[PDB]
Structure 1
Amino acid sequence: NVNSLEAYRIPVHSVTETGAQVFGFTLQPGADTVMERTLLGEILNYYANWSGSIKLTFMYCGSAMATGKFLLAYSPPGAGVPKNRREAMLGTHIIWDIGLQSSCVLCVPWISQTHYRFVSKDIYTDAGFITCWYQTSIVVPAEVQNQSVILCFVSACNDFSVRLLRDSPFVRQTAFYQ
């Protein structure tokens, strides 16, 4: 789906009971396969040691008549990845409702041993595991489509920092450009 615009759509729909995992991804701005090519991921791929808080913002692009609540968690490491919703709400979470306000903010705070992290993939510094969950399902009335699209945004808070320059691993050339 990366050879298309389909990669930005997070699908979400009415479930049978409740409490399933829509999406979920590691927090590595520079070493992930999710936020690798985003603007924050590009700038941090020009750096090596970063710190500070990261905002996510979730626009809901469904219909004007459907509602639903979504648990937006953050699980710091030491434990694994929470496999059900009961294990997911024991971290920094937020319970977001869909109304007039179509976009939420999960402002991930800074919980860390060291001051600074690493951009590259390593074992000593791991960050957290975003996992989104149905708080309820999507109740939609008749003559409306069932499935919709959630988007995700990313940015940085007031105390974000980068420390060491380097070359980014995205430049892959062979010869000169005559």
Structure 2
Amino acid sequence: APIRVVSVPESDSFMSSVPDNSTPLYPKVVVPPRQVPGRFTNFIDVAKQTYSFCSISGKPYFEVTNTSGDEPLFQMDVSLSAAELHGTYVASLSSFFAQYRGSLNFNFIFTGAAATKAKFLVAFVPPHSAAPKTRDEAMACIHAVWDVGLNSAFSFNVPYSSPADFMAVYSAEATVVNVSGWLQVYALTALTSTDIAVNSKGRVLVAVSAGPDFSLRHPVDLPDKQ
């Protein structure tokens, strides 16, 4: 009658994430009904239905002035480890995982006065020797022309382009699964105003959301701070 059993070598070990529960010692507790609004079941949903502001030089926006042209106003490399993605929800949620997949949605909100106007060219530049320095260079790439004064807000989707099905959350010296290129914003025209003495500059807030195809996998433990 006693059952012949063979003890596996990994026997008395711990294994932290076993797919099984411990023995219960305090049964039959019926818990009170928890009505309460706003329950969420998956972090990816709040990442997709919500936006955070980027950290451009410590502020949540870049500026256009009545003197601008050529040079890029905003530039960030496409990696969740990028600096301008620092204080964001999507970037911060990501540190819990090893890999990501999908697009990021950026939306720019021009907060310059109603008496103010400017036009922007926003480009997604794929991995390359070295990042364009002027807009005539970048305009060969995927880009959109944002004329404020048509819509004060503009959404741009940074796509996912890679031979790998997922890329790394934690970047490092450039690898083929580390970085996906750059996102740049140029001034197609400098800020014009009704009176340059009253309005000389206007600020574009830049916010990020997880794209519809965005996903995160492989939960990871936090490494030494840096």
Q: TM-score, normalised by structure 1?
A: 0.85
Task: Tell me the distance in 1 between the aligned counterparts of 2:198 and 2:150.
Answer: 18
State the partner residue of 1:161: 215
| CA 1:39–1:91: 2 relative to 1, 3 Å | same
1:43 matched to 2:97? The reply is: no
| CA 1:157–1:78: 2 relative to 1, 3 Å | same
Shift of 1:101: 2.3
Task: Tell me the distance in 1 between the aligned counterparts of 2:58 and 2:92.
Answer: 21
SS in 2 for 1:131: strand
What runs of 5+ residues in structure 1 fail to find an aligned partner? 173-178
Task: Tell me the distance in 2 between the aligned counterparts of 1:149 and 1:78.
Answer: 29
State the partner residue of 2:189: 136
CA contact (8 A) 1:57 1:152 kept: yes
After the TM superposition, which residues 89-128 of structure 1 pair with which residues of structure 2 at under 5 Å, given as runs? 89-99=139-149, 101-122=151-172, 123-125=175-177, 126-128=179-181
Shift of 1:171: 6.5
Higher RCO (CA 8 Å, separation ≥ 6 residues): 1
Matched residue pairs, number? 166
State the partner residue of 1:21: 72
SS in 2 for 1:49: strand
Greater mean alpha carbon deviation, residues 106-115 or residues 45-54: 106-115
Greater mean alpha carbon deviation, residues 73-82 or residues 136-145: 136-145
CA contact (8 A) 2:71 2:133 kept: no
State the partner residue of 1:175: none
Task: Tell me the distance in 2 between the aligned counterparts of 1:81 and 1:169.
Answer: 31
Task: Tell me the distance in 1 between the aligned counterparts of 2:151 and 2:180.
Answer: 29
2:205 counterpart letter in structure 1: L
SS in 2 for 1:151: strand
The structure where strand makes up a greater share of residues is: 2
Q: What is the root-mean-square deviation of aligned Cα atoms in Å?
A: 2.1
SS in 2 for 1:155: strand
SS in 2 for 1:41: helix
2:88 counterpart letter in structure 1: T
- Runs of 4+ in structure 1 over 4 Å off: 169-172
Task: Tell me the distance in 1 between the aligned counterparts of 2:129 and 2:92.
Answer: 29
CA contact (8 A) 2:124 2:142 kept: yes
